[PDB]
CSV table of C-alpha atoms and ligand atoms in Angstrom, one decimal:
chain,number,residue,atom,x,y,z
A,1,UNK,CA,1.7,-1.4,-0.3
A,2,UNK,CA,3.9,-2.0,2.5
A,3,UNK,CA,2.7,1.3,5.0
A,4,UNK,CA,6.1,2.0,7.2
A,5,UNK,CA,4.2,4.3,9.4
A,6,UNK,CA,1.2,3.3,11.9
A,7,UNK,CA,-1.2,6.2,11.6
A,8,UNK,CA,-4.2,6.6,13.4
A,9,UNK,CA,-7.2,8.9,12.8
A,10,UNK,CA,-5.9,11.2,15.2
A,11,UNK,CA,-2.6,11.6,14.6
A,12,UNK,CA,-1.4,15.7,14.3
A,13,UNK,CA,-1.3,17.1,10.5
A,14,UNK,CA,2.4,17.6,9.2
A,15,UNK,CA,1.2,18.7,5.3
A,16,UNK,CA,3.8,16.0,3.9
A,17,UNK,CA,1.7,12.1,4.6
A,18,UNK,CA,-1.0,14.1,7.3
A,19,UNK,CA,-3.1,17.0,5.6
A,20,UNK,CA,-6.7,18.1,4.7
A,21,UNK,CA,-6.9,17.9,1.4
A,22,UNK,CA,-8.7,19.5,-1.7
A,23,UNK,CA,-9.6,16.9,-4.9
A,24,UNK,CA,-9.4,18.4,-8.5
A,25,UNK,CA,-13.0,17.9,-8.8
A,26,UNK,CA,-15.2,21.0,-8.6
A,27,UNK,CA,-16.7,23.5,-6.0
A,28,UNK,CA,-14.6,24.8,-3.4
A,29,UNK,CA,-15.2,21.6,-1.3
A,30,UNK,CA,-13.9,21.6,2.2
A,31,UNK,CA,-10.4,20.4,2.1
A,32,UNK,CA,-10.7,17.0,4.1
A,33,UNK,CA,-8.0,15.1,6.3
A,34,UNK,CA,-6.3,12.5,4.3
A,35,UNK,CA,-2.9,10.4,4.9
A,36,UNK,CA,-0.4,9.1,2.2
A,37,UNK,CA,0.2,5.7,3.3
A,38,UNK,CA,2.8,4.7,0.4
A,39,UNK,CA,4.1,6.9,-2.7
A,40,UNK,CA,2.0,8.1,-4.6
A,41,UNK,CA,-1.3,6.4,-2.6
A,42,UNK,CA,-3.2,8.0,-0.5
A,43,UNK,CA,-6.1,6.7,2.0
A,44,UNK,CA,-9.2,9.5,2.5
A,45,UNK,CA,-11.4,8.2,5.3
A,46,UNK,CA,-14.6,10.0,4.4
A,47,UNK,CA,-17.9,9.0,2.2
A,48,UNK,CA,-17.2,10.0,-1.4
A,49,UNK,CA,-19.6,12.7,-2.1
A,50,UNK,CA,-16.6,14.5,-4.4
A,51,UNK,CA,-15.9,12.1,-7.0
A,52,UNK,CA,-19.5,12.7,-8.6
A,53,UNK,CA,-21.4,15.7,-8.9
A,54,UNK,CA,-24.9,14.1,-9.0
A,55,UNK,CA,-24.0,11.4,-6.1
A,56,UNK,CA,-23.7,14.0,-3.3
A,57,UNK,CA,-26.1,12.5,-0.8
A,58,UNK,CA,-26.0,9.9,1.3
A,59,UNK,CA,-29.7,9.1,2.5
A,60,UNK,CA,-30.8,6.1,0.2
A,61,UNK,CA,-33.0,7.6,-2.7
A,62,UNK,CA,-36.7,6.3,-3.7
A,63,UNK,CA,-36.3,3.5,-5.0
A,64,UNK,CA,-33.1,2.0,-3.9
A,65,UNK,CA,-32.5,-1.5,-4.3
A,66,UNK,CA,-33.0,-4.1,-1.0
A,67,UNK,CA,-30.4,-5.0,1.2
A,68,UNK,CA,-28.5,-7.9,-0.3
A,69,UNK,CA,-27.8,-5.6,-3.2
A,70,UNK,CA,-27.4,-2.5,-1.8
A,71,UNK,CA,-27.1,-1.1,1.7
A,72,UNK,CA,-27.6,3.0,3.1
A,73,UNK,CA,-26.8,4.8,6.5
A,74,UNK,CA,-26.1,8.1,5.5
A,75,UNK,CA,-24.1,8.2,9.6
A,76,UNK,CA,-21.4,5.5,8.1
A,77,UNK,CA,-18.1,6.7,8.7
A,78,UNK,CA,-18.7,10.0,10.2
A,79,UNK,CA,-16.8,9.9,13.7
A,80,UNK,CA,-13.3,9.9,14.3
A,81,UNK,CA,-13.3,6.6,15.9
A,82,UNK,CA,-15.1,5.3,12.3
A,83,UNK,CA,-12.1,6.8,10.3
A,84,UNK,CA,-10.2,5.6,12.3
A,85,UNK,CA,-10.8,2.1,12.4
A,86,UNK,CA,-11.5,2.4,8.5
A,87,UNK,CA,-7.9,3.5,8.2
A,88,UNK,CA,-6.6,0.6,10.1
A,89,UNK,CA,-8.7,-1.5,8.1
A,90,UNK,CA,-7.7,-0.3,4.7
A,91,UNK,CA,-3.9,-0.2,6.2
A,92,UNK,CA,-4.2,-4.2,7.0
A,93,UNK,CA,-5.6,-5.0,3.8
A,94,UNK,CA,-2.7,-3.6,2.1
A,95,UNK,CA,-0.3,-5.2,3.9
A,96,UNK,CA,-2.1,-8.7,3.2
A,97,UNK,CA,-2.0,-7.9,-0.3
A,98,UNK,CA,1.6,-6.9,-0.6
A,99,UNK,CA,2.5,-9.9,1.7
A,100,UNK,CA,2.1,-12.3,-1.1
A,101,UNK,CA,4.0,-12.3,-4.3
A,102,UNK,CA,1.5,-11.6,-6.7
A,103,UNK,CA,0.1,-8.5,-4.9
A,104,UNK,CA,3.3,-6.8,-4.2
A,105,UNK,CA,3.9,-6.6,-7.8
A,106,UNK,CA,0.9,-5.4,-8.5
A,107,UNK,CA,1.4,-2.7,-5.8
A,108,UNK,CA,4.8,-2.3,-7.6
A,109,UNK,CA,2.8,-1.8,-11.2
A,110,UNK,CA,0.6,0.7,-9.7
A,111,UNK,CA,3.4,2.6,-8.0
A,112,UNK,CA,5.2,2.5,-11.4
A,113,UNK,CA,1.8,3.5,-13.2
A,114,UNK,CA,1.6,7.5,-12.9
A,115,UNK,CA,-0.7,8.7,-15.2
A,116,UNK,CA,0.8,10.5,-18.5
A,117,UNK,CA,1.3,13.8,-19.0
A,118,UNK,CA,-0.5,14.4,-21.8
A,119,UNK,CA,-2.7,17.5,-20.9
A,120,UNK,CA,-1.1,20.8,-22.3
A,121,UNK,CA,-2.6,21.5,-26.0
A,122,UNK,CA,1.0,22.0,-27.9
A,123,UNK,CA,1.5,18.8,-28.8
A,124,UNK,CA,5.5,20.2,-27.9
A,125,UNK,CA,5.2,20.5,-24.5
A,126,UNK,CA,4.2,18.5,-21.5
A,127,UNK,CA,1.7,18.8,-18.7
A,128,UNK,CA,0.1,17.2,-15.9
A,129,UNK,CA,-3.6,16.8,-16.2
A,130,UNK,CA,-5.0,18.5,-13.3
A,131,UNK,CA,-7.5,15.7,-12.1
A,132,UNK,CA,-4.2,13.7,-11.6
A,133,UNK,CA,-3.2,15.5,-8.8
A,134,UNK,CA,-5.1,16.4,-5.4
A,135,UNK,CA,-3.9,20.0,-3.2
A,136,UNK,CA,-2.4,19.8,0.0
A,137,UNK,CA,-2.9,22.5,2.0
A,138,UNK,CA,0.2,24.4,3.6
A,139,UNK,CA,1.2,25.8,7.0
A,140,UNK,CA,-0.1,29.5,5.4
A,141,UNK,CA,-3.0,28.2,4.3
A,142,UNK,CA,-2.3,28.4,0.5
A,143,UNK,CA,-2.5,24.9,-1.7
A,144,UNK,CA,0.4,22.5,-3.3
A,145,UNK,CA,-0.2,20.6,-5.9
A,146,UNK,CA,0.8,16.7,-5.7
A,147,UNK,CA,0.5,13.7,-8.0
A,148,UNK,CA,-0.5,10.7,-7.1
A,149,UNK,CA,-1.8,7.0,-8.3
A,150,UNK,CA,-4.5,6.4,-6.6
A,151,UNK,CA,-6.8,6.9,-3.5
A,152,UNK,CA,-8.8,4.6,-1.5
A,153,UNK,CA,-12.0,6.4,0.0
A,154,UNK,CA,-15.1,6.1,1.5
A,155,UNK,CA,-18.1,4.6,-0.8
A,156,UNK,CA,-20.7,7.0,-1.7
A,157,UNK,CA,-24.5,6.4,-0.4
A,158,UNK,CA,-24.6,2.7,-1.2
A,159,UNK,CA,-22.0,1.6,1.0
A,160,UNK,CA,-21.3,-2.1,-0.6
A,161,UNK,CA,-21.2,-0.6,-4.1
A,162,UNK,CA,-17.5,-0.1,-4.5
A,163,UNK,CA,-15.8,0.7,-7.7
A,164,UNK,CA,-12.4,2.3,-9.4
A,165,UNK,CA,-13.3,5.5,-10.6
A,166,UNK,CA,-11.7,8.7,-11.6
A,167,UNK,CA,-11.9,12.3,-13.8
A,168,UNK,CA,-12.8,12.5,-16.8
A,169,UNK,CA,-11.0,14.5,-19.8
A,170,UNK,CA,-13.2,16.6,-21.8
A,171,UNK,CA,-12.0,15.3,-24.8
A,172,UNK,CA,-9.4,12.2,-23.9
A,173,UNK,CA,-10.5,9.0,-22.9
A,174,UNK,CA,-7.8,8.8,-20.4
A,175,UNK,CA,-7.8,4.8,-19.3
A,176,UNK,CA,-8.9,3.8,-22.9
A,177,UNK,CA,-5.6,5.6,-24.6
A,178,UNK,CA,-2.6,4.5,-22.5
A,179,UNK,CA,-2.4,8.0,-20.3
A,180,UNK,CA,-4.0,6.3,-17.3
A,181,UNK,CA,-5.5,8.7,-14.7
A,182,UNK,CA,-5.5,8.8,-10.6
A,183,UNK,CA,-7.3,6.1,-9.2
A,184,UNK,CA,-10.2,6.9,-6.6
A,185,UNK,CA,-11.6,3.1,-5.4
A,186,UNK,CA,-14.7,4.2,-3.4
A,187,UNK,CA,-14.1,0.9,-0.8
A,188,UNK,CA,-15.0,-0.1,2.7
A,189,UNK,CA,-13.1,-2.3,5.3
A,190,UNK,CA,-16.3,-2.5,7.6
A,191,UNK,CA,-18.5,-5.2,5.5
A,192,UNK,CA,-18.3,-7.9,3.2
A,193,UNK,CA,-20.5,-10.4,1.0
A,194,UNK,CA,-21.4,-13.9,1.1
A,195,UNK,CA,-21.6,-16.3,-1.3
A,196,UNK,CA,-22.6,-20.2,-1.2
A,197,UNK,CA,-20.2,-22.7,-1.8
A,198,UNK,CA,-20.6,-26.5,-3.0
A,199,UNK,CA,-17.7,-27.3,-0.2
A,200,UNK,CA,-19.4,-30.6,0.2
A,201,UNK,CA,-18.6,-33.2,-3.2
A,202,UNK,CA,-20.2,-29.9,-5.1
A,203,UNK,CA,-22.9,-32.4,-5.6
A,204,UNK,CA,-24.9,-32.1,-2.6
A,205,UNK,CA,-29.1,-33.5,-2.8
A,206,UNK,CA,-30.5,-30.7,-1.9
A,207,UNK,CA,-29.1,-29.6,1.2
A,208,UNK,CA,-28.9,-26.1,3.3
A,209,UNK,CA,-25.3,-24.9,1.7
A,210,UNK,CA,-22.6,-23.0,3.8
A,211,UNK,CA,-22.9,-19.5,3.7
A,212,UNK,CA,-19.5,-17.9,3.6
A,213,UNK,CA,-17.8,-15.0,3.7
A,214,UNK,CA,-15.6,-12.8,1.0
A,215,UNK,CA,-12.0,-11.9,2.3
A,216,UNK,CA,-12.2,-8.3,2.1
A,217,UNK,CA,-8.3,-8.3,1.1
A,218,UNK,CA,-9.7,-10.8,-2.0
A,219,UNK,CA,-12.4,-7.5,-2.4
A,220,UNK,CA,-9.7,-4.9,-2.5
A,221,UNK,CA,-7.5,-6.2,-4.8
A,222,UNK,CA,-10.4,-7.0,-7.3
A,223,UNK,CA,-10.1,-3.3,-7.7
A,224,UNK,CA,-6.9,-2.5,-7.4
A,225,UNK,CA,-6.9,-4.6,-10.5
A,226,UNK,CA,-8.9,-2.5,-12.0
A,227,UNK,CA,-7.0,0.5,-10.7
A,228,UNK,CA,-4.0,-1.2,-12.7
A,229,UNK,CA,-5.8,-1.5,-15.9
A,230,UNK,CA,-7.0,2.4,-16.0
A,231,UNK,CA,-3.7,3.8,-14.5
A,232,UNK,CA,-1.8,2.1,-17.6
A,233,UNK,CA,-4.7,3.7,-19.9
A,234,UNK,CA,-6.1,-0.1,-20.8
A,235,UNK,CA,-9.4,-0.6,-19.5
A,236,UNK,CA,-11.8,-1.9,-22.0
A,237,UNK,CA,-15.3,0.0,-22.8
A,238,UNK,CA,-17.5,-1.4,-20.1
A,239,UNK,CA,-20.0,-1.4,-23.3
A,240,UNK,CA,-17.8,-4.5,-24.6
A,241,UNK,CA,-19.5,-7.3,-23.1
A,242,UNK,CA,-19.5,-11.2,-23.2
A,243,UNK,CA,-22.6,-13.8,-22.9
A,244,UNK,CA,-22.1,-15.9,-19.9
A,245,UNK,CA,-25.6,-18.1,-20.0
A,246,UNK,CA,-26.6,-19.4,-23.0
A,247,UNK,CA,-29.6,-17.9,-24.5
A,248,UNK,CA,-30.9,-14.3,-24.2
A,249,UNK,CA,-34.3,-12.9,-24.0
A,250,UNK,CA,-36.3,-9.9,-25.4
A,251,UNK,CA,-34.4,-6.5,-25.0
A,252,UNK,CA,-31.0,-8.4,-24.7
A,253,UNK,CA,-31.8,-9.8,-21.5
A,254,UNK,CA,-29.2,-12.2,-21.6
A,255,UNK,CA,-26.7,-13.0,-18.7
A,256,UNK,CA,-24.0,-10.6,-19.9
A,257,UNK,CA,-20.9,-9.4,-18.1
A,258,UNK,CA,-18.2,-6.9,-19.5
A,259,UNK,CA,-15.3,-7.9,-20.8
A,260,UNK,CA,-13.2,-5.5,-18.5
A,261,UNK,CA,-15.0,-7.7,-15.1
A,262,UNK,CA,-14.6,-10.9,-16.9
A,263,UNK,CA,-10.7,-10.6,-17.5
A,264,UNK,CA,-10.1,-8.9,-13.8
A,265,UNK,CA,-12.3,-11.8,-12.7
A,266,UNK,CA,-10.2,-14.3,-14.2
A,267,UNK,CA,-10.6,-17.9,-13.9
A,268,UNK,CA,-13.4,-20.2,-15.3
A,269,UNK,CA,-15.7,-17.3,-16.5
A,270,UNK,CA,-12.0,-16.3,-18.8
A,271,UNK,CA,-13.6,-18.4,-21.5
A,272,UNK,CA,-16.3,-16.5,-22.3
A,273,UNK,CA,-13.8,-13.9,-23.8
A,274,UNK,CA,-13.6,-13.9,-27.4
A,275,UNK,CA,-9.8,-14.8,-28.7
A,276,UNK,CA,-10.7,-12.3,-31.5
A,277,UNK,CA,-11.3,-9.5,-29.6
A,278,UNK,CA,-8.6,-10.0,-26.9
A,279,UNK,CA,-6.0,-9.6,-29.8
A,280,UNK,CA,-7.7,-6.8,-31.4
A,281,UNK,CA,-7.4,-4.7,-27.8
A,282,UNK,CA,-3.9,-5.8,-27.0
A,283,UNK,CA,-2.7,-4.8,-30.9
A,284,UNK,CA,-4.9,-1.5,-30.3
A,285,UNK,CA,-3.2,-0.4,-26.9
A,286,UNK,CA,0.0,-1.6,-28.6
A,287,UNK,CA,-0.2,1.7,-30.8
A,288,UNK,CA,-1.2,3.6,-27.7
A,289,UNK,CA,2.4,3.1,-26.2
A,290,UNK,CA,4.2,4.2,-29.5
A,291,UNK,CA,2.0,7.4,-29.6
A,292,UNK,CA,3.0,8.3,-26.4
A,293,UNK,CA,6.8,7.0,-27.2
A,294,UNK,CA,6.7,9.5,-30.1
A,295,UNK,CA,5.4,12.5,-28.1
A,296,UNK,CA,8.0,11.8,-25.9
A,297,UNK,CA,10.3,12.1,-28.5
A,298,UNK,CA,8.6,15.3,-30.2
A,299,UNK,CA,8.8,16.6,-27.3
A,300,UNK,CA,10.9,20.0,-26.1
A,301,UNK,CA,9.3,22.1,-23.4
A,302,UNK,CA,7.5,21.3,-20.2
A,303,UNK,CA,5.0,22.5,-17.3
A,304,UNK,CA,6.1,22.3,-13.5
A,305,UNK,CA,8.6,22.8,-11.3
A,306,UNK,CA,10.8,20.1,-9.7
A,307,UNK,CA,10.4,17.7,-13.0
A,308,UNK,CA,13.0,17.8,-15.9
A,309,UNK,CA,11.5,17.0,-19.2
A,310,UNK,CA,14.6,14.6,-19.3
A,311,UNK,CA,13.8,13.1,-15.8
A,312,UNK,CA,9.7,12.8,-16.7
A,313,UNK,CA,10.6,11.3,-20.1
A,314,UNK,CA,12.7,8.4,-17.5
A,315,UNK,CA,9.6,7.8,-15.6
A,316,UNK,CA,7.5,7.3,-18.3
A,317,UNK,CA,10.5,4.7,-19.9
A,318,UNK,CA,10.4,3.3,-16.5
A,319,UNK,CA,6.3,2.8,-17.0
A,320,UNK,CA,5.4,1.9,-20.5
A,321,UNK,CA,9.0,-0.4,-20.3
A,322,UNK,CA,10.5,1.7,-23.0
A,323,UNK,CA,13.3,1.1,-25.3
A,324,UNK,CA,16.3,3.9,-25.2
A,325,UNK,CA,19.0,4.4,-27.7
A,326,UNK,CA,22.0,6.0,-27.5
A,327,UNK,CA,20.7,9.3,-29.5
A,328,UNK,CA,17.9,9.1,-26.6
A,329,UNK,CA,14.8,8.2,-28.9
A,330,UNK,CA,12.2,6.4,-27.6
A,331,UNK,CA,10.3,3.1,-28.9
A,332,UNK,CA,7.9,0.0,-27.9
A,333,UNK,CA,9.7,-2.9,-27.6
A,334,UNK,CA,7.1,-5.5,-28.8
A,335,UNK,CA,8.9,-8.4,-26.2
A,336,UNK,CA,8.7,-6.0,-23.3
A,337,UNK,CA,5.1,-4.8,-24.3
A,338,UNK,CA,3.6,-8.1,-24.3
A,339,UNK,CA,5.3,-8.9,-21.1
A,340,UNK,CA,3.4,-5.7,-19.2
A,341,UNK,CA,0.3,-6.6,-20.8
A,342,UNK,CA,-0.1,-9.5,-20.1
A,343,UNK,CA,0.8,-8.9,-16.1
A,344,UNK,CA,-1.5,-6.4,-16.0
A,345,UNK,CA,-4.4,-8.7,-18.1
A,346,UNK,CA,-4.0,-12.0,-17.3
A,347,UNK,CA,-1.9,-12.8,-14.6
A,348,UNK,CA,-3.3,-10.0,-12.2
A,349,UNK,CA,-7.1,-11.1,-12.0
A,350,UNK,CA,-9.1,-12.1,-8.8
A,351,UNK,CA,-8.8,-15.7,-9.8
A,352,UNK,CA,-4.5,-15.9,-8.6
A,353,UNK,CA,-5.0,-13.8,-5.7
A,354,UNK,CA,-7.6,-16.6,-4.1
A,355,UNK,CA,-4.8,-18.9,-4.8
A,356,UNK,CA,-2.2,-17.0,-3.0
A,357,UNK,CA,-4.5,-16.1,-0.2
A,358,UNK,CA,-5.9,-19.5,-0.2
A,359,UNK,CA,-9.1,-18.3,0.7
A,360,UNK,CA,-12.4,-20.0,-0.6
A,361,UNK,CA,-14.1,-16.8,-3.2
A,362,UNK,CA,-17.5,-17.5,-5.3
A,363,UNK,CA,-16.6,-19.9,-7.9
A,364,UNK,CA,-18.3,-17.9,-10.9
A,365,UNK,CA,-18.1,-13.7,-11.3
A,366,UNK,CA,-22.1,-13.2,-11.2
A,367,UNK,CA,-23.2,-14.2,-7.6
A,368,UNK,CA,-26.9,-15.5,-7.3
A,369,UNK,CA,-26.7,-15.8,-3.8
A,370,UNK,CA,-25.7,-12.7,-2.4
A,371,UNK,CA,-25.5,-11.7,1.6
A,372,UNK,CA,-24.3,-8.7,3.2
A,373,UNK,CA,-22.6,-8.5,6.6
A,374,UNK,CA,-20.8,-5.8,8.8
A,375,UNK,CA,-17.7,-7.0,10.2
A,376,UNK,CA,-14.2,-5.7,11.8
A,377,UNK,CA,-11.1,-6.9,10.8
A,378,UNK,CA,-8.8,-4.5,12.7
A,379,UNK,CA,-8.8,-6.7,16.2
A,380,UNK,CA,-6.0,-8.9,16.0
A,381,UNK,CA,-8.1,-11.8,17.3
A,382,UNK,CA,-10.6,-11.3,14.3
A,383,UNK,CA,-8.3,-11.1,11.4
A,384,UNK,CA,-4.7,-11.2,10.5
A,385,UNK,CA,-2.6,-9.9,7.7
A,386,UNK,CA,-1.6,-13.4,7.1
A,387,UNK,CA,-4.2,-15.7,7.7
A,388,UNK,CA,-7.6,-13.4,7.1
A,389,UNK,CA,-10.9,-14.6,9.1
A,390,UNK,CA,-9.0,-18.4,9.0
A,391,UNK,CA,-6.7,-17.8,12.4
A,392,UNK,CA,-3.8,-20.8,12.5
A,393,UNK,CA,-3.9,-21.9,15.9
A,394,UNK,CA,-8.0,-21.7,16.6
A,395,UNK,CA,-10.6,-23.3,15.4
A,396,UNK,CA,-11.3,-21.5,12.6
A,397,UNK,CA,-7.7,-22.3,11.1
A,398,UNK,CA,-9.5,-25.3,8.5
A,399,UNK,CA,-12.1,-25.9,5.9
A,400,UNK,CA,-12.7,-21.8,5.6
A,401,UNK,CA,-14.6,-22.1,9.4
A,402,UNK,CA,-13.0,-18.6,9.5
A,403,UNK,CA,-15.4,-17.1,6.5
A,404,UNK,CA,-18.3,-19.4,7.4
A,405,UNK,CA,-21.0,-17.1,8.6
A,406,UNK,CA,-22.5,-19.4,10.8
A,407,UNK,CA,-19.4,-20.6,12.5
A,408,UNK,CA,-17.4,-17.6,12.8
A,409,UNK,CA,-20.9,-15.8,13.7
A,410,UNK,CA,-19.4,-13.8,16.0
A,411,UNK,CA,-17.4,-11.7,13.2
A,412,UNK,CA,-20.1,-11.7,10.6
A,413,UNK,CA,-23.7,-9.5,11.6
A,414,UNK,CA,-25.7,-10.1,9.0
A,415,UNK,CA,-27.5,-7.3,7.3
A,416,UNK,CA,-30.8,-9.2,6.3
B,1,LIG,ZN1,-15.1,-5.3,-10.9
C-alpha cells in the first residue's frame, strides 16, 4: 500500500524491511536481497526461478510462443540499476493503487488476509504453514522466520506472463479451503500490453484503430485481485470454466475462460457466469469459515513464539469477520460473511478499478489484438501516481493520448 519509506536498490541491509532473503521453497537457494515495503508485503527484485522447480531457466525454450504472446531475455533484471528501477516501479504502482478508494481497501483486505494457521496435524493445536513465511537472515548469519501476505517478484523466463502464485500443501488445497497462503505475483513494472479500442463511434468502416496501451497499475491490481481471492482461501478451480463465444468445436475448442478470470475481470464478460454455480461456491466457502471458526474454538495449544493462541485466535476474528461471545466462542455471522464475499468477488474486479483510474482497458477479458511494449514509468515526466501515462497539464492529459502508442511513442518501444 501506502510505502512510508523511499528505498532504493542500493540502500544498506538492516535485517528488519532490508535483508537477503531465503523462500520456503526448496534447495538451499542463495538467500536474495528483498525489502518490506508495507506489513506483511514484501517486493523481491529478481527473476523468479524459486517459486517453481521445473521453471528455473530463463533462456526461452524450443518452442516458445512469438512475441505478442510471450517475450524472453534471460539478462532482464539482472543489474542493480534494473532492480532498482523495478523497485521504484512496483513502489509507484502501489501507491496509485492505494490512492483511490477502491484499491486501498483492497490493500486493506490483503493486509487483513494472513493465511491460517492450519498446518500442525493435532487438530488441537495451531501452526503456521511453513510456505507462509520467507527467512530473514540475521546479523550472525543464522535465519528468522517471518510471515507475510504476499510478495511481488520478478517474472520467470517469459517476462509478460505474470501470475499470483504460491506453495502448495501436500494434502490441503490451501486457496480453495478458506486458509489462504502467501501470495508470490511474478510481475514486471518495465512493459505493458496493447489492445485496440473502438474510441471512434465503436462503429468505425474499416479503419486503422488506435493502438493503446494497458496502465500497468490497471495490470497489478488484476492480480492483486487474485492475490485477495487465494489469501482468503476462495479462488475457484481454474478447471471451472465458462463459454464466452457461442459454439465450440472438436476437442472443446470453444472460447472458454475460467470462472476465477471471468469474476476478477469483472464487467461485461460477468454474464457469462452461471447464477447456479456462483451460489453453490459462495454457500461452499460459507462452510469453510465455520470450519475454521470451530477449530478456533477446539482449539488449546499453539506453535511459535511471540503469538498467544488468544491473540492469533483475534487476528483470525479480525480476518474471517468473526462473531465473539461473551464465553469467547467463535461463529460466521451469515450478514458479515456475505459482506466480505462479496468485496472480495464482486466489487474488487479489474472492471471498478478502470473506473477509478479512468483509464481506457480492453473492453472484453480475451484480447485478440495483443502488442507488447517496454516502457518506464519511474520518470516523473513519463508517469504519475495520479494521472498514469495521461499527464494533466500536457498534451497527453485527453482522449487516453497518454496510452496511445503512436502518440505517446516516445514512452511505448514496441516489441514487434
Ligand atoms: Zn488473471
Amino acid at each position: 500500500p501506502f510505502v512510508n519509506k523511499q528505498f532504493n536498490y542500493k540502500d544498506p541491509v538492516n535485517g528488519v524491511d532490508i535483508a537477503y532473503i531465503k523462500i520456503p521453497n526448496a534447495g538451499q537457494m542463495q538467500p536474495v536481497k528483498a525489502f518490506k515495503i508495507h506489513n506483511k508485503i514484501w517486493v523481491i527484485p529478481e527473476r523468479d526461478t524459486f517459486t517453481n522447480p521445473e521453471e528455473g531457466d530463463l533462456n526461452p525454450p524450443p518452442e516458445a510462443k512469438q512475441v505478442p504472446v510471450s517475450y524472453y531475455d534471460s539478462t532482464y533484471l539482472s543489474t542493480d540499476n534494473e532492480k532498482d528501477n523495478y523497485l521504484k516501479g512496483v513502489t509507484k504502482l502501489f501507491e496509485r493503487i492505494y490512492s483511490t478508494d477502491l484499491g486501498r481497501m483492497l490493500l486493506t483486505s490483503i493486509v487483513r488476509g494472513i493465511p491460517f494457521w492450519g498446518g500442525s496435524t493435532i487438530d488441537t493445536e495451531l501452526k503456521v504453514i511453513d510456505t507462509n513465511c520467507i527467512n530473514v537472515i540475521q546479523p550472525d548469519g543464522s535465519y528468522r522466520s517471518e510471515e507475510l501476505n504476499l510478495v511481488i517478484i520478478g517474472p520467470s523466463a517469459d517476462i509478460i506472463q505474470f501470475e499470483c502464485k504460491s506453495f502448495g500443501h501436500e494434502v490441503l488445497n490451501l486457496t480453495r479451503n478458506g486458509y489462504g497462503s502467501t501470495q508470490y505475483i511474478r510481475f514486471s513494472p518495465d512493459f505493458t500490453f496493447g489492445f485496440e479500442e473502438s474510441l471512434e463511434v465503436d462503429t468505425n468502416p474499416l479503419l486503422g484503430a488506435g493502438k493503446f496501451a494497458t496502465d500497468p497499475a490497471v495490470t497489478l491490481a488484476h492480480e492483486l485481485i487474485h492475490a485477495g481471492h487465494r489469501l482468503y482461501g476462495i479462488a475457484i478451480n481454474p478447471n471451472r470454466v465458462f463459454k464466452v463465444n457461442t459454439n465450440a468445436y472438436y476437442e472443446m475448442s470453444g472460447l472458454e475462460v475460467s470462472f476465477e478470470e471471468l469474476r476478477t475481470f469483472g464487467g461485461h464478460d460477468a454474464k457469462f457466469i452461471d447464477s447456479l454455480q456462483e451460489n453453490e461456491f459462495r454457500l461452499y466457502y460459507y462452510n469453510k469459515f465455520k470450519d475454521i471458526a470451530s477449530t478456533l474454538n477446539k482449539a488449546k495449544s499453539i506453535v511459535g513464539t511471540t503469538a498467544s493462541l488468544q491473540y492469533m485466535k483475534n487476528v483470525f476474528k479480525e480476518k474471517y469477520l468473526l462473531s465473539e461471545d461473551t464465553s469467547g466462542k467463535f461463529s460466521v455471522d451469515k450478514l458479515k460473511f456475505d459482506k466480505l464475499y462479496k468485496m472480495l468477488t464482486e466489487i474488487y474486479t479489474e472492471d471498478n478499478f478502470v473506473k477509478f483510474f479512468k483509464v481506457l482497458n480492453r473492453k472484453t477479458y480475451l484480447n485478440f489484438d495483443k502488442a507488447v511494449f517496454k516502457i518506464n514509468i519511474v520518470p516523473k515526466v513519463n508517469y504519475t501516481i495520479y494521472d498514469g501515462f495521461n499527464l494533466r497539464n500536457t498534451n497527453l492529459a485527453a482522449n487516453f493520448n497518454g496510452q496511445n502508442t503512436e502518440i505517446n511513442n516516445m514512452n511505448f518501444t514496441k516489441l514487434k
